[PDB]
């Protein structure tokens, strides 16, 4: 009929500033169009379309986009990929992300799921048509999803299959929880245990719904690279690593929580298998708006901090979206 599932280069839009010092401003300066001040969304009357968060190429577009952003800004002084080294100019540039709309070129339209309790896979019955998505800060991190968009209705548990154990669990929060990360004038990061623990017992309520009233137990990450055992994230150009053993406390104790981070300059790359080293009053205040978890006897289930596939960080924002191409007929 009208429109079909399509794969086309998506252009980007930005409310950026060309003169800015923040470096994302130089990947949006002359790569993203000014954000349209009079957009249009159109309701598609008596129409149901089926979305699939886990299999859409807007995710892939965005990942290679952010890999490019990350390469040109903050090129590391020495990649290794063990088998051929590359030392290069590693100038110190400013850094912290800013939102970027993705947009169809003419002849295509973004279909938007408007069911607030859509989980990620299957039928949506309140479908809309848009030119550009909402703003999406390109931030890469593990275990916790920062500066993201909140679930507008009830807390959601996004997954491919909850019967499969491999597939990640994205919990999408209802209301955000802040997190201060400072390197005191070798670092730490504090959070208000009160609201955070309330929000968390909420998440185990919703989990209980999906795992019929069973016993929900958080546990630290098993093992492996430091970037999956720890809340690792690039904060204003410097890479933090905060031990999140505390936040997932199975005996919560409801006063301000402190976490011990390490700033590292030699890290494991996410662009592709390898390791990077970057040149050498810094603090990040951040809305925590989602969690990544992997489902691990008794009637107890064990949930452990996940992350690592940075695609999931994009899935969390782009589940409500499907590119389609308008067919003109009559």
């Amino acid at each position: 009929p009208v429109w079909k599932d399509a794969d086309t280069t998506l252009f980007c839009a930005s409310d950026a500033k060309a003169h800015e010092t923040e470096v994302h401003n130089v990947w949006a300066t002359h790569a993203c169009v000014p954000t349209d001040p009079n957009p249009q969304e159109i309701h598609l009357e008596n129409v149901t379309e089926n979305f699939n968060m886990w299999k859409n190429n807007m995710v892939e577009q965005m990942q290679e986009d952010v890999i490019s952003l990350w390469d040109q800004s903050l090129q590391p002084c020495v990649k290794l990929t063990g088998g051929s080294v590359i030392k290069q100019a590693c100038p110190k540039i400013s850094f912290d992300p800013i939102p970027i709309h993705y947009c169809t070129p003419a002849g295509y339209v973004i279909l938007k799921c408007n069911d607030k309790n859509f989980n990620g896979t299957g039928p949506c019955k309140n479908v809309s048509s848009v030119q550009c998505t909402h703003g999406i800060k390109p931030v890469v991190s593990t275990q916790l999803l920062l500066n993201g968009s909140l679930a507008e209705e009830e807390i959601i548990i996004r997954s491919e299959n909850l019967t499969n154990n491999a597939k990640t669990i994205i919990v999408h929060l209802n209301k955000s929880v802040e997190i201060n990360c400072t390197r005191p004038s070798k670092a730490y990061c504090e959070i208000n245990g009160t609201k955070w623990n309330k929000v968390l017992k909420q998440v185990t309520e919703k989990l209980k719904e999906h795992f019929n009233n069973k016993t929900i137990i958080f546990q630290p990450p098993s093992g492996g690279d430091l970037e999956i055992t720890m809340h690792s994230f690039n904060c204003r150009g410097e890479f933090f690593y905060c031990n999140t053993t505390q936040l997932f406390n199975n005996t919560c104790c409801n006063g301000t929580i402190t976490l011990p981070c390490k700033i590292k300059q030699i890290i494991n790359m996410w662009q592709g298998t390898g390791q990077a080293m970057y040149a050498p009053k810094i603090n990040c205040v951040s809305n925590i708006t989602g969690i990544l978890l992997t489902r691990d006897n008794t009637s107890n289930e064990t949930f452990r901090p996940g992350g690592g596939n940075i695609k999931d960080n994009w899935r969390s924002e782009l589940y409500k979206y499907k590119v389609v191409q308008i067919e003109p007929l009559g």
Partner: antibody
Amino acid sequence: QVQLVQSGPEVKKPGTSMKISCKASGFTFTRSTMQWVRQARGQRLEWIGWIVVGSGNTNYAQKFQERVTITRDMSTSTAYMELSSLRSEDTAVYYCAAAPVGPTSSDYWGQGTLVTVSS
Amino acid sequence: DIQMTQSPSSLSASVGDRVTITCRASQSIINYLNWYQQKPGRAPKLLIYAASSLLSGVPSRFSGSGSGTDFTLTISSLQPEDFATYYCQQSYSTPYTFGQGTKLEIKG
């Protein structure tokens, strides 16, 4: 025979209003957002507004925001434009046109309607 | 607000020629641009959608291309019923504005 037939010419006084019809045949009216245009003699074509048929959603240019009303009727498959407190520089040929959906697209055309506004 | 312009205002070519005709956008549309033909007394016809997409039933003579600001519509094998005024339009934003207009005359 894919086409759209509009109503006759109109001669109004400054301060009144006009209504113009547009009867569709040939495409599935069901999935189009009818678009309206005007051409002042030997000047530029101007986009006025649209009505998505299915939803009934509309939108207009900041220019005609407060005087224009776009409407339709799925029974007859017909669109309508109403233009309020007319002025002399609203004299022109008004066209309806068909179009896919989204925010704007491509468009099929009707015959045009000459309307003249003077004292 | 986006202001679209055309060049040239009028162009003269003869039968069987090839013509270029060029539209220009201020705030860079991406490829949200249509090309319409118009003969006096009659209503426009759609030649090109997107900026390269040709409508089914348009003679494959006409052809289009563009970037973000600068677009072009060539004819190539100019026939006698291609002596009209040609209009570029932007989709994308605000009031979807049309071009100044370009007329083709017989360069006989």
